[PDB]
Amino acid sequence: SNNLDSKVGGNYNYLYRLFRKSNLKPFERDISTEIYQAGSTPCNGVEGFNCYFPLQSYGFQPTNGVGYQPYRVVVLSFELLHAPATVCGPKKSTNLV
Amino acid sequence: STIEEQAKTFLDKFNHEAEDLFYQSSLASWNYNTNITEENVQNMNNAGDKWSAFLKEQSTLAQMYPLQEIQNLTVKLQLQALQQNGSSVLSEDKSKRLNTILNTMSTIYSTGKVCNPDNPQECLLLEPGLNEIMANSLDYNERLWAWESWRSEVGKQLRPLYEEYVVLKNEMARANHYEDYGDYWRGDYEVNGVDGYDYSRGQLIEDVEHTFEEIKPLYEHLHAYVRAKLMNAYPSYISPIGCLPAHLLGDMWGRFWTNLYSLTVPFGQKPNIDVTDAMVDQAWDAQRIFKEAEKFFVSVGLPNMTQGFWENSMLTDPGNVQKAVCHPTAWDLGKGDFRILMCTKVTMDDFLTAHHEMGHIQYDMAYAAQPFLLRNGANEGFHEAVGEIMSLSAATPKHLKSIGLLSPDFQEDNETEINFLLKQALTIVGTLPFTYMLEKWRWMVFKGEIPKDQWMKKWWEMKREIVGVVEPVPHDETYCDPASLFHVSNDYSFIRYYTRTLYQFQFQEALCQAAKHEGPLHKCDISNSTEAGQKLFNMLRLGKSEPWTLALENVVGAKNMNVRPLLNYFEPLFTWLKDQNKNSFVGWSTDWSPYAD
């Protein structure tokens, strides 16, 4: 997407979670902005010593290196539950005789 | 919780924010150097001052994480630069005045000039003008006029600026727990926190001294060879056992002797290796020079170059409206955006500089996987060394005839190699004693061993002893030779050249073991051998995250610099200079002076 989602001067729209007190489970979305406490210094949503804002914004410009270029990633989650199946693969019809 | 976990949290967040500002700082610094506009000069200073002050603001929380409680080598080496607070450890007076000293010495260096006594209306600037005249002039008086008058108007003016340059920089080093500012650059090699790989700061004094002794037998034969040729030119001012005048060294400050090759030619009836006229026959342009250079990096086993590198490179200067610096330079920006600023003509040196400038980027793409504070050369000498190791084998007749530049009818023998090795020797051999001389003299003055009155007394005394060079005009303590140097006035490392030659020949020799080449070094060609880039990339990707002795040991297996690759590379010349110097005196004597009769 480097010709689309990146622009001169940087694109701050796309963020990420740099710090968290633990590891997330599969299929877990956490939007919590709570400040990560590195040491014993109290934070309570206030920045300071050992208090750092976890979310960070990717620098995106068209000149970034291939490994650092922004890429649009679409992850397809296929979940088979006890409920009947809904989405099916393509059905390609042929001529009739 | 622990200091190792607390500091790692600060350093992980810092790597993201510092990479954004430093890249934009180098991007604005790139846009101005390549294109001169009034918008880029403001963005270069703004983005440069923001990132410079960004590390000063974050160094308050970084200095609270000592390196004794951290067992991680990466975390300690990242905080090592953040522990130094820059202008903060200095007092408000000493910090603000220091910036004035470094800026004033650069203004005098850039705006300085020496007028022509024969043409009062013609006054030539230092760069290129005064460096060009001292380059091509064979005359005794024409060189001495611009050589002596410079240090009178400039060198004498830079003496009080050099006085503050010694004092104000030592106060910052002593606040950093360093002996002096001479130890500040001895701290560039400093290694602590690893068992057995630690590097003593005071060991560097013996390291460069033990190597210079092995350079003597190669330098004594060449210095006596050049002195014997210059003796017939000036028999009164040049003794066979004496020293050569300081203004005849071939350039302004005596850095390179390369322009004296015309008189020193070993054989006038034998050809030498030159691709300048060969590139005219093969018809290669600036776009195809870097194009043919990438194929060499792929064949040797090094990673290729991205399309953004070759497309966005700056190949020339589109006039004065948008002006690009023609001095070859490779700027490291970040985020995988790497570019090279050079004015590309058709010459043999531009092809060797092509692999030289791309060698910086070839090293830059290796450590890009490391954290930002771990993204850098392991020292200041590895930057310029990685570029030359690609150009050493690129000038070999094996690769030149494979790509088509050098004609296959070209005869390769001892007579043709010595002509080419000596032309490169004056650039190589001529730099080592002069560079080992200047930095060693700074270590003594920064320490205080040399009183202010003996600055030039020890300078010219160490000049006759080291490089065997005597002054035509005796200089008192009022003059200062090193203050006019580009590296000293701009606070850059000039010793990187003495270390490069010992680094570049080690990096080249060890790869020839995997490239299956034996004998002299110049006969080794790493092209088409994939094992060269494989063993080299493992060292280049570490950067300074590991001790520079560790990365050096991963290739050559040595923890220090070695002159043995310098000997075998010039071995056809070293054995030839010994034969020609049989009728002369090897070495030099410090008791001869041109003005003392």
List all residues 6 or more positions away from B236 whose beta carbon is below 8 Å from its beta carbon.
Answer: B594
Nearest Cα to Cα of residue B3 among B69, B62, B57: B69
Instruction: Tell me how far apart the alpha carbons of residues B40 and B28 are, in angstroms, rounded to a whole number.
Output: 6
Instruction: Compute the distance between CA of residue B86 and CA of residue B172 in angstroms, rounded to an integer.
Output: 8
Calculate helix-pair angle for B571-580, B414-428, nearest 10 degrees. 90
Contacts of B335 in chain A (CB under 8 A): 59, 61, 63-65, 68
Cα B118–B119–B123 angle (5° rounding)? 120
Experiment used for this model:
cryo-EM
- Residue B442 contacts residue B483 (beta carbons within 8 Å): no
Residue B281: alpha-carbon gap to chain centroid: 33
3-state helix, strand, coil in chain A (%, to 5): 5, 10, 85
Long-range contacts of B168-177 (CB under 8 A, 24+ apart): B168/B90, B168/B94, B168/B97, B168/B98, B168/B101, B169/B98, B169/B446, B169/B491, B170/B446, B171/B90, B171/B91, B171/B94, B172/B86, B172/B89, B172/B90, B172/B98, B175/B89, B175/B90, B176/B83, B176/B84, B176/B89
Regarding beta strands A55-57 and A15-17, do their DSSP bridges make them parallel or antiparallel, or are they unpaired? Answer: antiparallel
Chain A residue with Cα closest to B313: A63
- From B487, B509, B517, B546, active-site residue: B487
Which of these, B371, B350, B143, B369, lies nearest to B259 by C-alpha position?
Answer: B143
Q: Between B10, B12, B337, which is nearest A65 by CB? A: B337
Q: Report the distance separating Cα B300 and Cα B533, nearest Å.
A: 5
Query: Are the beta carbons of B245 and B470 closer than 8 angstroms?
Result: yes
From the list B238, B17, B259, B21, the residue with the least C-alpha distance to B131 is B259
Exposure string over B95-129, b if 16+ CB within 10 A, otherwise e: beebeebbebbeebbeebbbeeeeeeeeebebeee
* Residue B596 burial (CB count, 10 A): 8
Q: Out of A39, A49, A65, name the one closest to residue B335 (CB).
A: A65
**Any CB–CB contact under 8 A between A49 and chain B?**
yes
Q: Which residues, 6 or more positions from B326, have their beta carbon under 8 angstroms from its beta carbon?
A: B317, B342, B343
In angstroms, how far apart are the furthest CA atoms of chain B? 76
Long-range contacts of A38-46 (CB under 8 A, 24+ apart): A38/B1, A38/B5, A38/B6, A38/B9, A38/B10, A39/B1, A39/B5, A39/B6, A40/B1
Do residues B103 and B394 lie in contact, with contact meaning Cβ atoms separated by under 8 Å?
no
Length of chain B: 597
Strand duo B244-245 + B469-470: pairing: parallel
What single DSSP character describes residue B272?
-
The resolution of the experimental structure, rounded to one decimal in Å, is 3.8
Q: Mutate which of B4, B5, B17, B20 to disrupt the A interface (most A C-beta within 10 Å)?
A: B20
CA distance B486 to B489: 6
Q: Are B147 and B134 in contact (CB under 8 A)?
A: yes
Chain A residues whose beta carbon lies within 8 Å of the beta carbon of residue B308: 63, 65-66
Supply B583's token pair. 């009728």
Residue ranges of the annotated binding site of B for chloride are 151, 459, 463
User: If DSSP codes are grouped into helix, strand and coil, which group holds residue B314?
Assistant: strand
The answer to whether the beta carbons of residues B510 and B383 sit under 8 Å apart is: no
Whether the link from the prior residue into B128 is cis, omega within 30° of 0, is yes
Per-residue b or e along B324-353, where b marks 16 or more CB atoms closer than 10 Å to that residue's CB: beeebebbbbbbbbbbbbbebebebebbbb
Looking at residue B147, its amino acid is W
Q: What is the DSSP letter of B172?
A: H
Dihedral sign computed on CA atoms, order B219, B555, B371, B65? negative
Q: Which residue of B has its CA nearest to A40?
A: B1
Q: What is the CA radius of gyration of chain A?
A: 22
Residue B399 is a catalytic residue: no
φ, ψ dihedrals at B357, nearest 5°: -70, -40
Q: How would DSSP label each residue in B348-366?
A: HHHHHHHHHHHHHHHHHTT
Distance from CA of B335 to the nearest CA of A (A): 5
Rounded to an integer, what distance in angstroms lies between the CA atom of residue B585 and that of residue B401? 40
Tokens of B265: 């030619």
The sign of the CA dihedral B277, B282, B287, B289 is negative
- Output the six-digit token pair for B249: 């060294």
Say yes or no for a CB contact (<8 Å) between B1 and A61: no
Instruction: Quote the DSSP letter at residue B338.
Output: E
Interface test with B, best of A36, A37, A50 (most B CBs within 10 A): A50
Query: 3-state secondary structure string, B139-165?
Result: CHHHHHHHHHHHHHHHHCCCHHHHHHH
CA dihedral sign, ordered B517, B511, B348, B405? positive
Of the partner residues A10, A36, A56, the one whose CB lies closest to the CB of residue B16: A56
Residue B560 Cα distances to B69, B343, B499, angstroms: 29, 36, 10
Residues 6+ apart with CB under 8 A from A19: A36, A52, A54, B9, B12, B13
Report the helix count and the strand count for chain A, using DSSP H and E. 0, 4
CA B314 to chain centre: 22
Nearest-5° Cα angle at B158, B153 to B164: 160
Place of tokens 């080299």: B536
- Name the active-site residue from B357, B417, B546, B571: B357
- Residue B51 CB contacts under 8 Å (≥ 6 apart), including other chains: B18, B21, B22, B24, B25
Contact status, residue B36 vs residue B108, Cβ threshold 8 Å = no
| Residue closest to B255 by CA, chosen among B497, B483, B499 | B497
A36 part of contact set with chain B, CB < 8 Å: yes
Q: What gap in Å lies between CA B469 and CA B230, rounded to an integer?
A: 13
Burial code of B467-491, b = ≥16 C-beta within 10 A, e = fewer? bbbbbbeebeeebbbbbbbebbbee
Tell me the binding residues of B for substrate: 255, 327-328, 497
